[PDB]
């Protein structure tokens, strides 16, 4: 009363929150992949069940079971492949969707940041696990090097690793509790999206200029279902491309082996998305300090909010920020394939080099050039 | 031994994003394992069944199947008995275990070839070199005992003694057996072998390409259509004056 | 008796520039390496060099001549 | 006052059939629809295959 | 949950705008939209592809400086 | 592992107050030719080659 | 010196929020003083700086700028709230300190 | 016209509309496999089992 | 657990049997089942008597 679309206790929100929600009129296209995420979500889990309909979590038949499932199952290999992959495509638009929101400061909206933070450092996990359930040589050698990193807690270290295995060393137990755990992480994930995007209607989207934007806003629809349909579609056909056209371009052939807790490989990488932070936990020659410049190293990201210094919100109208910005960007593709590279020279040093300049653009040279910069429009 | 060298790019009848395997050359390639590879190689993930409709015809693959005594059971009294065998059983071990097969090639384990193709840096380009590139070890190299000299296998100390020479076996289908028309039809075998939908992968990848060429130009339009309203808009301050 | 068109062509290949360049240096350094005994030198290097020009080079015209 | 006030000039971006001043936009209507309309239709058949 | 109506106050501003059935597509593709598509490129490609270019190098450099300490330096054999 | 003497000494003579973990390579081993230990990096795992 | 008076004319070319008709203090980020400040506008001013605004928006929308003749230049630039800010902050500043 | 046509006889009712899109994917469907299939069988002559057949189905 | 015919019983017994206080952790759930359906039995019942169903 008197329509069916405001009053209904269910249909309200589907229509308080996808279809009259006000949105900035001038909202880009890197405010899509915050979609794209959860469509990218949505569709992991699907892919996901699926999956898990034939996988069994038992280092015996673990590896065995993925063949299978690939070969006997009707379709079944595609569905791997959109899995695997999608995975990527789930890392990528993250990882734009956080730059998006550093250049156009959306982390003054702290809660829905933060939120954000802690999904990503959920996803990260659980792309972790996932990863082990096939029980390749790479996902014993990864699910025996990562855990371990736990190792680096004085006290509680050694002993806190033994319930991750479940033993005193990579084994069944292990693998089984991973699927549990990969099985149930991503449910978590969708859980908190709730929240973040809950916070994030307290304030409205941000926006590319960074000013008001009360001044004129318009329906998410059908202003920005169509513009996300549409960005659906542009990012969905180079992913389809890659799993259709080149399955194994991103991943490593060496998990084509079944695992061996006799041999570590000799060429030790692991998949793309980790190397940054592979980088930077090498480029310390220290158990600890490689840790902990390893956990800085993401655990940075809730300090951003207290590190801007510029008296506008978003760095359109800031080259000098900009141009560091962009530096920044540059500077961990760098670190990635610093992390591609084994330990030697030249790479040791460019790897110790690059993690310092990215912890010092985000530490000092950020909040320096901002404040700077605030004097040069005479605040 | 730092360094290595690394293979090159033979241009496969398949290699192409809409190139299928060539299925004459993958039917050799299995007679190349077969009655070659099959007496050190096992191939665990594939069987019989698989190359009906794609390589052999039913009736061939039946007869295939029952050149080889199987073991099944146990039976009414419990024991272990031995059987022809059925399009449903997979390609035989040369070995009951891994320990078997090193003691019978120097302590040298010669890996299943089921996912080969997809398991060593370069694919089916790197095992066609091994297999051909064998040769002699260049001044100051000294191979030990018992192992070969390939310069294209990691260490260059390789346990496999060359595997094939022109003749070595003879083709059904009236083709030249020379050394590397083998190693290209074995390793075409091999890639098969390792990602049987392959073909149905690809055609599926140019469909994909049709369809999200033309709906994402259909919505490029559906779009701007609805955005054109705020994109021609114009506005105008008038104050009262 | 049958020709394996791999060696017809990997004879022809040997002639480029490329090639003989690298065999020499390769001759070279077999001569001075075999005829020296508590070294260290390998003429893996070299050979490499070699193998790799010759092997490209058979890359791009053996397919043709196989069925 | 409000009648110092004027629709500007749409012409840039007005469709060819509606561009004339002096010409109905009612028998120009039934194609300038069909069409959007069957993009529309079209890209509808597309998803749903 | 309704945001539209309580945002801000704003006074004296006319805007006109026209159906979409009576507008076209995509207009003026070469007078307007690209010569705009390029302005952009060019205000932006000097913030952006130093650093990246900058990467580039040091790519090249360290890949190349490595590939070039494989290789062997005669004058430990000339003895 | 069986080491030789090509080896043996060339571990014996190795400023033994500047490890991380301070010891002579006498302390470790029984009988020289055979030094025998748990292939386990300590650093986070992987099997030393 | 003349120099940062060189340099600032720069920057302010620089940052170019004048392309879209944008004061200085349009761009201004909203804290809470900002939000004060505007609020003591007077009624004018505040009309204005909303169009500017709504206009600015409705550009970056569009993803064109002002052509050359219109955009703001240094000189030409009102800081229309720099001084009922600095006396809101003023103002705070107080309210703190006295609470000791 | 056949856009007029169209706009009233299908675009126009959104029962029509619909019932379009319905029977309409149908026609779609059934002609785009037939030609993907045959852009694909074509572009690889000769290398597929369905070529190759004949060798062998005794017949 | 470990899903799959010829280990799924066997599973069971080793987590009652080998796992610390996995009998317990078992017992719990087991029944908590039951008692879940009771409750849910009473909570529908508690509905239907005072007319919850309005
Ligand atoms: C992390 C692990 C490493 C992964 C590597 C990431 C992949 C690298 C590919 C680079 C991405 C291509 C970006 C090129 C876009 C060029 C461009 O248009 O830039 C200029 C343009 C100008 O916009 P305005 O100033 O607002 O103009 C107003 C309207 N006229 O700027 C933008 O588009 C906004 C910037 C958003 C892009 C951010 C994406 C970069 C990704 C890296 C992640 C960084 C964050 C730190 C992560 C810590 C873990
Ligand atoms: C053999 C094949 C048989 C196929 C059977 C499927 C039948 C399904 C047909 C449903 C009928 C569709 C009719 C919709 C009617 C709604 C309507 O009014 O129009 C569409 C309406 C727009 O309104 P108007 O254009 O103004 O229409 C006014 C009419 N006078 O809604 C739309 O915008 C529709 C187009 C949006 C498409 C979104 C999908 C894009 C996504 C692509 C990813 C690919 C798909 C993968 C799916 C995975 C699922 C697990
Ligand atoms: C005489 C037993 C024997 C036969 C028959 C044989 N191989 Fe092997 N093969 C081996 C051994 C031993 C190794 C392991 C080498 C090692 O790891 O030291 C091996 C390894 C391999 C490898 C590479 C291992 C690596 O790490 O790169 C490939 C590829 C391979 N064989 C292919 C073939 C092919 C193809 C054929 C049939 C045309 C064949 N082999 C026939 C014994 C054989
Ligand atoms: C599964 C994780 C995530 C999903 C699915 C997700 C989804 C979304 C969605 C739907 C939006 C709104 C539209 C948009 O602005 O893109 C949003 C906004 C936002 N998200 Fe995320 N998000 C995720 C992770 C993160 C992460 C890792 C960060 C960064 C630490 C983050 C920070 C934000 C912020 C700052 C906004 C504000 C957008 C704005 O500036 O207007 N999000 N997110
Ligand atoms: C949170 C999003 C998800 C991400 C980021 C993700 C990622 C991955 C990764 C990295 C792998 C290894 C893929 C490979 O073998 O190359 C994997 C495997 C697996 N995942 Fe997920 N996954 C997600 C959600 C799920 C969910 C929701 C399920 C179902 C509960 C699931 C079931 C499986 C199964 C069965 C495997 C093992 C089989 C296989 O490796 O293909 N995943 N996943
Ligand atoms: C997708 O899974 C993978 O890539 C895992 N596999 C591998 O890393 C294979 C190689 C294993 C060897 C070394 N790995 C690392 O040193 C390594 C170090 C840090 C990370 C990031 C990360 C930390 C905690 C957490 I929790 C998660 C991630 C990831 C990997
Ligand atoms: C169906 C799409 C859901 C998108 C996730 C956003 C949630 O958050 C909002 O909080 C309000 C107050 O509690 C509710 O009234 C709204 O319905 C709800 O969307
Ligand atoms: C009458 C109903 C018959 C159903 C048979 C299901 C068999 C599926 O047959 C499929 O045909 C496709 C043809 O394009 C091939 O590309 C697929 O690989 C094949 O699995």
Same mark, same amino acid.
């Given at each position: 009363?008197?329509?069916?679309?405001?009053?209904?206790?269910?249909?309200?929100?589907?229509?308080?929150?996808?279809?009259?929600?006000?949105?900035?009129?001038?909202?880009?296209?890197?405010?899509?992949?915050?979609?794209?995420?959860?469509? @990218?979500?949505?569709?992991?889990?699907?892919?996901?069940?699926?999956?898990?309909?034939?996988?069994?979590?038992?280092?015996?038949?673990?590896?065995?079971?993925?063949?299978?499932? @690939?070969?006997?199952?009707?379709?079944?290999?595609? $569905?791997?492949?959109?899995?695997?992959?999608?995975?990527?495509?789930?890392? $990528? @638009?993250?990882?734009?969707?956080?730059?998006?929101?550093?250049?156009?400061?959306?982390?003054?909206?702290?809660?829905?940041?933060?939120?954000?933070?802690?999904?990503?450092?959920?996803?990260?996990?659980?792309?972790?696990?996932?990863?082990?359930?096939?029980?390749?040589?790479?996902?014993?050698?990864?699910?025996?090097?990562?855990?371990?990193?736990?190792?680096?807690?004085?006290?509680?270290?050694?002993?806190?690793?033994?319930?991750?295995?479940?033993?005193?060393?990579?084994?069944?137990?292990?693998?089984?509790?991973?699927?549990?755990?990969?099985?149930?992480?991503?449910?978590?994930?969708?859980?908190?999206?709730?929240?973040?995007?809950?916070?994030?209607?307290?304030?409205?989207?941000?926006?590319?200029?960074?000013?008001?934007?009360?001044?004129?806003?318009?329906?998410?629809?059908?202003?920005?279902?169509?513009?996300? $349909?549409?960005?659906?579609?542009?990012?969905?056909?180079?992913?389809?491309?890659?799993?259709?056209?080149?399955?194994?371009?991103?991943?490593?052939?060496?998990?084509?082996?079944?695992?061996?807790?006799?041999?570590?490989?000799?060429?030790?990488?692991?998949?793309?998305?980790?190397?940054?932070?592979?980088?930077?936990?090498?480029?310390?020659?220290?158990?600890?300090?490689?840790?902990?410049?390893?956990?800085?190293?993401?655990?940075?990201?809730?300090?951003?909010?207290?590190?801007?210094?510029?008296?506008?919100?978003?760095?359109?109208?800031?080259?000098?920020?900009?141009?560091?910005?962009?530096?920044?960007?540059?500077?961990?593709?760098?670190?990635?394939?610093?992390?591609?590279?084994?330990?030697?020279?030249?790479?040791?040093?460019?790897?110790?080099?690059?993690?310092?300049?990215?912890?010092?653009?985000?530490?000092?040279?950020?909040?320096?050039?901002?404040?700077?910069?605030?004097?040069?429009?005479?605040? | 031994?730092?360094?290595?060298?690394? *293979?090159?790019?033979?241009?496969?009848?398949?290699?192409?994003?809409?190139?299928?395997?060539?299925?004459?050359?993958?039917?050799?390639?299995?007679?190349?394992?077969?009655?070659?590879?099959?007496?050190?190689?096992?191939?665990?993930?594939?069987?019989?069944?698989?190359?009906?409709?794609?390589?052999?015809?039913?009736?061939?693959?039946?007869?295939?199947?029952?050149?080889?005594?199987?073991?099944?059971?146990?039976?009414?009294?419990?024991?272990?008995?031995?059987?022809?065998?059925?399009?449903?059983?997979?390609?035989?071990? *040369?070995?009951?275990?891994?320990?078997?097969?090193?003691?019978?090639?120097?302590?040298?384990?010669?890996?299943?070839?089921?996912? =080969?193709?997809?398991?060593?840096?370069?694919?089916?380009?790197?095992?066609?070199?091994?297999?051909?590139?064998?040769?002699?070890?260049?001044?100051?190299?000294?191979?030990?005992?018992?192992?070969?000299?390939?310069?294209?296998?990691?260490?260059?100390?390789?346990?496999?003694?060359?595997?094939?020479?022109?003749?070595?076996?003879?083709?059904?289908?009236?083709?030249?057996?020379?050394?590397?028309? =083998?190693?290209?039809?074995?390793?075409?075998?091999?890639?098969?072998?390792?990602?049987?939908?392959?073909?149905?992968?690809?055609?599926?990848?140019?469909?994909?390409?049709?369809?999200?060429?033309?709906?994402?130009?259909?919505?490029?339009?559906?779009?701007?259509?609805?955005?054109?309203?705020?994109?021609?808009?114009?506005?105008?301050?008038?104050?009262?004056? | 008796?049958?020709?394996?068109?791999?060696?017809?062509?990997?004879?022809?290949?040997?002639?480029?520039?490329?090639?003989?360049?690298?065999?020499?240096?390769?001759?070279?350094?077999?001569?001075?390496?075999?005829?020296?005994?508590?070294?260290?030198?390998?003429?893996?290097?070299?050979?490499?060099?070699?193998?790799?020009?010759?092997?490209?080079?058979?890359?791009?015209?053996?397919?043709?001549?196989?069925? | 006052?409000?009648?110092?006030?004027?629709?500007?000039?749409?012409?840039?971006?007005?469709?060819?059939?509606?561009?004339?001043?002096?010409?109905?936009?009612?028998?120009?209507?039934?194609?300038?629809?069909?069409?959007?309309?069957?993009?529309?239709?079209?890209?509808?058949?597309?998803?749903?295959? | 949950?309704?945001?539209?109506?309580?945002?801000?106050?704003?006074?004296?501003?006319?805007?006109?705008?026209?159906?979409?059935?009576?507008?076209?597509?995509?207009?003026?593709?070469?007078?307007?939209?690209?010569?705009?598509?390029?302005?952009?490129?060019?205000?932006?490609?000097?913030?952006?592809?130093?650093?990246?270019?900058?990467?580039?190098?040091?790519?090249?450099?360290?890949?190349?400086?490595?590939?070039?300490?494989?290789?062997?330096?005669?004058?430990?054999?000339?003895? | 592992?069986?080491?030789?003497?090509?080896?043996?000494?060339?571990?014996?003579?190795?400023?033994?107050?500047?490890?991380?973990?301070?010891?002579?390579?006498?302390?470790?081993?029984?009988?020289?030719?055979?030094?025998?230990?748990?292939?386990?990096?300590?650093?986070?795992?992987?099997?030393?080659? | 010196?003349?120099?940062?008076?060189?340099?600032?004319?720069? #920057?302010?070319?620089?940052?170019?929020?004048?392309?879209?008709?944008?004061?200085?203090?349009?761009?201004?980020?909203?804290?809470?003083?900002?939000?004060?400040?505007?609020?003591?506008?007077?009624?004018?001013?505040?009309?204005?700086?909303?169009?500017?605004?709504?206009?600015?928006?409705?550009?970056?929308?569009?993803?064109?700028?002002?052509?050359?003749?219109?955009?703001?230049? #240094?000189?030409?630039?009102?800081?229309?709230?720099?001084? #009922?800010?600095?006396?809101?902050?003023?103002?705070?500043?107080?309210?703190?300190?006295?609470?000791? | 016209?056949?856009?007029?046509?169209?706009?009233?006889?299908?675009?126009?009712?959104?029962?029509?509309?619909?019932?379009?899109?319905?029977? +309409?994917?149908?026609?779609?469907?059934?002609?785009?496999?037939? +030609?993907?299939?045959?852009?694909?069988?074509?572009?690889?002559? +000769?290398?597929?089992?369905?070529?190759?057949?004949?060798?062998?189905?005794?017949?």
């Amino acid at each position: 009363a008197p329509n069916i679309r405001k009053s209904h206790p269910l249909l309200k929100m589907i229509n308080n929150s996808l279809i009259d929600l006000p949105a900035p009129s001038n909202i880009s296209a890197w405010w899509n992949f915050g979609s794209l995420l959860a469509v @990218c979500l949505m569709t992991q889990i699907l892919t996901g069940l699926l999956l898990a309909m034939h996988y069994t979590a038992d280092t015996s038949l673990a590896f065995s079971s993925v063949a299978h499932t @690939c070969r006997n199952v009707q379709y079944g290999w595609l $569905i791997r492949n959109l899995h695997a992959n999608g995975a990527s495509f789930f890392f $990528i @638009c993250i990882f734009l969707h956080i730059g998006r929101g550093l250049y156009y400061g959306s982390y003054l909206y702290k809660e829905t940041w933060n939120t954000g933070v802690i999904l990503l450092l959920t996803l990260m996990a659980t792309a972790f696990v996932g990863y082990v359930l096939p029980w390749g040589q790479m996902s014993f050698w990864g699910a025996t090097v990562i855990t371990n990193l736990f190792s680096a807690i004085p006290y509680i270290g050694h002993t806190l690793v033994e319930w991750a295995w479940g033993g005193f060393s990579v084994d069944n137990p292990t693998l089984t509790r991973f699927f549990a755990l990969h099985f149930l992480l991503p449910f978590a994930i969708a859980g908190i999206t709730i929240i973040h995007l809950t916070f994030l209607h307290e304030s409205g989207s941000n926006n590319p200029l960074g000013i008001s934007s009360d001044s004129d806003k318009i329906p998410f629809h059908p202003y920005y279902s169509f513009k996300d $349909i549409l960005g659906l579609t542009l990012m969905l056909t180079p992913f389809l491309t890659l799993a259709l056209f080149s399955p194994n371009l991103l991943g490593d052939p060496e998990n084509f082996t079944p695992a061996n807790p006799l041999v570590t490989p000799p060429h030790i990488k692991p998949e793309w998305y980790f190397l940054f932070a592979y980088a930077i936990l090498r480029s310390i020659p220290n158990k600890l300090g490689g840790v902990l410049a390893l956990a800085a190293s993401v655990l940075i990201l809730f300090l951003i909010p207290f590190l801007h210094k510029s008296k506008q919100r978003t760095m359109t109208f800031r080259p000098l920020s900009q141009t560091l910005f962009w530096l920044l960007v540059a500077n961990l593709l760098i670190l990635t394939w610093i992390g591609s590279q084994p330990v030697e020279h030249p790479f040791i040093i460019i790897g110790q080099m690059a993690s310092l300049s990215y912890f010092t653009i985000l530490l000092i040279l950020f909040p320096t050039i901002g404040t700077l910069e605030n004097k040069m429009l005479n605040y | 031994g730092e360094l290595e060298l690394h *293979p090159p790019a033979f241009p496969w009848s398949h290699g192409g994003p809409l190139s299928a395997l060539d299925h004459s050359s993958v039917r050799r390639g299995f007679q190349v394992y077969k009655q070659v590879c099959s007496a050190c190689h096992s191939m665990d993930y594939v069987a019989f069944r698989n190359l009906i409709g794609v390589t052999h015809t039913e009736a061939e693959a039946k007869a295939l199947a029952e050149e080889v005594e199987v073991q099944d059971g146990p039976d009414e009294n419990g024991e272990l008995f031995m059987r022809p065998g059925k399009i449903s059983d997979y390609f035989p071990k *040369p070995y009951p275990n891994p320990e078997a097969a090193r003691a019978a090639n120097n302590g040298a384990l010669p890996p299943d070839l089921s996912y =080969i193709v997809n398991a060593r840096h370069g694919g089916e380009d790197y095992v066609f070199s091994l297999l051909t590139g064998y040769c002699d070890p260049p001044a100051g190299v000294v191979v030990r005992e018992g192992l070969h000299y390939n310069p294209y296998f990691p260490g260059q100390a390789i346990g496999m003694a060359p595997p094939i020479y022109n003749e070595i076996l003879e083709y059904d289908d009236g083709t030249p057996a020379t050394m590397s028309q =083998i190693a290209k039809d074995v390793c075409t075998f091999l890639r098969w072998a390792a990602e049987p939908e392959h073909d149905q992968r690809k055609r599926m990848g140019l469909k994909m390409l049709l369809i999200s060429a033309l709906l994402t130009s259909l919505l490029y339009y559906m779009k701007r259509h609805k955005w054109s309203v705020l994109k021609s808009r114009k506005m105008a301050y008038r104050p009262p004056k | 008796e049958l020709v394996d068109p791999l060696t017809t062509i990997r004879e022809h290949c040997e002639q480029t520039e490329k090639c003989v360049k690298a065999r020499e240096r390769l001759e070279l350094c077999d001569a001075r390496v075999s005829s020296r005994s508590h070294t260290e030198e390998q003429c893996t290097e070299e050979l490499f060099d070699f193998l790799h020009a010759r092997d490209h080079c058979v890359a791009h015209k053996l397919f043709n001549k196989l069925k | 006052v409000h009648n110092d006030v004027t629709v500007p000039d749409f012409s840039a971006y007005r469709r060819e059939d509606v561009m004339d001043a002096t010409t109905s936009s009612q028998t120009s209507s039934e194609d300038r629809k069909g069409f959007s309309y069957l993009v529309t239709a079209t890209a509808c058949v597309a998803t749903a295959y | 949950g309704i945001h539209f109506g309580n945002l801000a106050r704003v006074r004296h501003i006319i805007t006109y705008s026209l159906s979409p059935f009576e507008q076209r597509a995509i207009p003026n593709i070469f007078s307007d939209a690209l010569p705009n598509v390029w302005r952009r490129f060019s205000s932006q490609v000097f913030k952006v592809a130093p650093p990246f270019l900058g990467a580039y190098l040091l790519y090249s450099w360290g890949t190349q400086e490595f590939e070039r300490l494989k290789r062997k330096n005669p004058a430990d054999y000339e003895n | 592992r069986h080491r030789t003497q090509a080896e043996i000494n060339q571990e014996a003579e190795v400023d033994v107050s500047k490890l991380r973990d301070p010891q002579h390579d006498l302390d470790r081993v029984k009988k020289p030719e055979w030094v025998i230990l748990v292939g386990v990096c300590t650093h986070l795992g992987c099997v030393p080659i | 010196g003349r120099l940062m008076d060189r340099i600032r004319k720069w #920057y302010y070319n620089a940052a170019g929020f004048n392309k879209y008709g944008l004061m200085r203090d349009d761009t201004l980020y909203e804290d809470d003083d900002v939000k004060e400040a505007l609020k003591r506008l007077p009624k004018d001013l505040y009309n204005e700086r909303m169009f500017r605004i709504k206009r600015a928006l409705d550009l970056s929308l569009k993803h064109r700028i002002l052509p050359k003749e219109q955009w703001v230049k #240094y000189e030409e630039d009102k800081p229309y709230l720099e001084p #009922y800010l600095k006396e809101v902050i003023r103002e705070r500043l107080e309210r703190e300190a006295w609470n000791k | 016209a056949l856009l007029r046509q169209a706009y009233s006889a299908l675009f126009r009712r959104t029962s029509t509309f619909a019932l379009t899109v319905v029977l +309409g994917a149908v026609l779609f469907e059934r002609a785009f496999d037939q +030609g993907a299939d045959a852009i694909f069988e074509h572009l690889n002559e +000769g290398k597929l089992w369905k070529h190759i057949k004949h060798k062998y189905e005794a017949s």
